[PDB]
Design a binder for these strands. Structure first.
Ligand SMILES: CCN(CC)C(=O)CCC(=O)NCCCN(CCCNC(=O)CCC(=O)N(CC)CC)C(=O)CCC(=O)NCC#Cc1cn([C@H]2C[C@H](O)[C@@H](COP(=O)(O)OP(=O)(O)OP(=O)(O)O)O2)c(=O)[nH]c1=O
Ligand SMILES: [Mg+2]
Ligand SMILES: [Mg+2]
Length: 539
DNA sequence: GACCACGGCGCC
DNA sequence: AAAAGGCGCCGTGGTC
């Protein structure tokens, strides 16, 4: 390409090199743009950012987040990553996409700019005639990248002092547990080492091994195994408590406080847009889509996520979203009727599980019940279910008969979906988002049937993901005009931040946007709460 | 210091 | 652990 002085003409593709992958933390080392057989290299990248109207090219969202961090309103535009991801969601990295569609991902901005231009041309070509994928690109993914950029640069407020204090308290409790574990073993060892624990439980103490690990066939010490052994030796309960506490402390309590950004004073995640097989987003660095919520200590941690002073958090969560999607995709009259009547399948199952009436099902019971509902829907075995519910195998097998019989046209949809996947080599969401599942023709049964479970889960999980993304795209500009903020997405949930005066109006508005995103054969219901912290906001 | 594979486990 | 699916991060163990 012909070397040409900065700045580039408008519509040029950008290339850029960060000192580290996280755009809120990165130094912009270099910046370039490419168009019309030219390549322009910015003498000083930060200053050159101001000359661009739009970030167009590979990882456009990351450069846009960096720009917002610097006070520049630079929105992301076309990104070949989004084109490739729609063509095949195993296209998750620029290294791979480059190799697959016409170049190499190097460490030089000018080369990355040229690459973006070339790859865009080629991938755009491949999407011609693919009208549904085109609609997903233009109406969903592309605008969604702009929304994600704002969410990332905005961040979420965290009560750091609270977490610091919590750490010291959990440390003492952890020591109480580990000391007792060592007393019971008769000697200390690295309790964090599942290999050392394996030998203590199964070789030294006389406990029966229950299961083996997947890759290396060691005797497993997983929570499920320990659960089954909870009454064979008092050390087992202590170990389970130890695991709970150390998991929460090492993953959330200790790391999160150290990740507060000096400029914003908030915590900033990344919402990865080309990272999953089904079309869901993922979150990393840190992952804010797996903040604890179940146990007492977990809830204490979620309480650390708080609203700016003068603001409130608003949490909105789609009700039984994948069951409703299933009703629509399958067209099952019984299931559709359930939602037209306003029934709650999770409460109902929770009612059967704990042997209480529906009004007796508390939040944590209902939670347990959804693991069972989706567990079964997506192929859980009779054997496993009996083990979890701690009931006879015959009771577990029975529950699964009744489950699929109540909703007769589901299996038809599953069989239709699997046959279709075998022929085309891929399955599809409602909107035509694709996932290739070649192992549907595998000759090994365990491999083939695992593939089948992935394949028929995908249209359901993926449609739910399409709906939520579309909702985010419609909702974002409405929040901007009300002076509220979109902060996080957790798959079928959004967390917004609104000024106190407008929080009620924002909650109502967001609820309606989410419910009316794309009407289905059953209503979509959204549960909404308002609060000073994330736990309170989910009520 | 960093990379991986693994087991394990937090959320949806 | 097991015929639920989708993720990312932790510490260990082994390298490099
Ligand atoms: C090989 C087979 N293998 C391997 C593992 C598996 O198949 C893998 C599965 C997996 O990887 N791990 C398994 C589950 C692990 N455990 C717990 C561990 C167990 N230890 C205890 O219980 C201890 C008890 C305890 O301490 N105490 C307190 C001390 C009490 C319990 C959790 O996830 C914990 C967290 C949790 O349950 N959070 C709920 C959940 C969930 C799921 C969601 N979805 C999809 C559809 C939904 O529609 C959509 C939206 O979700 P959501 O909005 O929520 O639901 P709805 O929209 O439908 O309903 P409403 O919005 O109306 O309410 O997402 C799934 O596909 N599967 C799901 O499980
Ligand atoms: Mg939900
Ligand atoms: Mg949810």
């Amino acid at each position: 390409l012909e070397e040409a002085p900065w700045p580039p003409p408008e519509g040029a593709f950008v290339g850029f090199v960060l000192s580290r992958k996280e755009p809120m933390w990165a130094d912009l080392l270099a910046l370039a743009a490419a168009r019309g057989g030219r390549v322009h290299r910015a003498p000083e990248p930060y200053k050159a950012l101001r000359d661009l109207k739009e970030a167009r090219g590979l990882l456009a969202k990351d450069l846009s987040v960096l720009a917002l961090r610097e006070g520049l309103g630079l929105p992301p535009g076309d990104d070949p990553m989004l084109l490739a991801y729609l063509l095949d969601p195993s296209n998750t990295t620029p290294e791979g996409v480059a190799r697959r569609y016409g170049g190499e991902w190097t460490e030089e901005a000018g080369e990355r700019a040229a690459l973006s231009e070339r790859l865009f041309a080629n991938l755009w070509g491949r999407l011609e005639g693919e009208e549904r994928l085109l609609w997903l690109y233009r109406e969903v993914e592309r605008p969604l990248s702009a929304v994600l950029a704002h969410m990332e640069a905005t961040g979420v407020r965290l009560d750091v002092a609270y977490l610091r204090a919590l750490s010291l308290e959990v440390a003492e409790e952890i020591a109480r547990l580990e000391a007792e574990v060592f007393r019971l073993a008769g000697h200390p060892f690295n309790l964090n080492s599942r290999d050392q624990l394996e030998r203590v439980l199964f070789d030294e103490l006389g406990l029966p091994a229950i299961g083996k690990t997947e890759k290396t066939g060691k005797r497993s010490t997983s929570a499920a195994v320990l659960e089954a052994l909870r009454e064979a030796h008092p050390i087992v309960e202590k170990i389970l408590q130890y695991r709970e506490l150390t998991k929460l402390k090492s993953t959330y309590i200790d790391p999160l406080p150290d990740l507060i950004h000096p400029r914003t004073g908030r915590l900033h995640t990344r919402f990865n847009q080309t990272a999953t097989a089904t079309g869901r987003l993922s979150s990393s660095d840190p992952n804010l889509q797996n903040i604890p919520v179940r146990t007492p200590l977990g809830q204490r941690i979620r309480r650390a996520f708080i609203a700016e002073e003068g603001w409130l958090l608003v949490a909105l969560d789609y009700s039984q979203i994948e069951l409703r999607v299933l009703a629509h995709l399958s067209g099952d009259e019984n299931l559709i009727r359930v939602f037209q009547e306003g029934r709650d399948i999770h409460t109902e199952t929770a009612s059967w599980m704990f042997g209480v009436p529906r009004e007796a099902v508390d939040p944590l019971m209902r939670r347990a019940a959804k693991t069972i509902n989706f567990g079964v829907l997506y192929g859980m075995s009779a054997h496993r279910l009996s083990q979890e519910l701690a009931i006879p195998y015959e009771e577990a097998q029975a529950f699964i008969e009744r489950y699929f019989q109540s909703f007769p046209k589901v299996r038809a949809w599953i069989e239709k979906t699997l046959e279709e996947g075998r022929r085309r080599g891929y399955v599809e969401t409602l909107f035509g988002r694709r996932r290739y599942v070649p192992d549907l023709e595998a000759r090994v049964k365990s491999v083939r049937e695992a593939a089948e479970r992935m394949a028929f889960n995908m249209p359901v999980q993926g449609t739910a993901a399409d709906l939520m993304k579309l909702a985010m795209v419609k909702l974002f500009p409405r929040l901007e005009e009300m002076g509220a903020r979109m902060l996080l997405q957790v798959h079928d949930e959004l967390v917004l931040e609104a000024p106190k005066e407008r929080a009620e109006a924002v909650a109502r508005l967001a609820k309606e946007v989410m419910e009316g995103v794309y009407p289905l054969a059953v209503p979509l219901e959204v549960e909404v709460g308002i609060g000073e912290d994330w736990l309170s906001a989910k009520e």
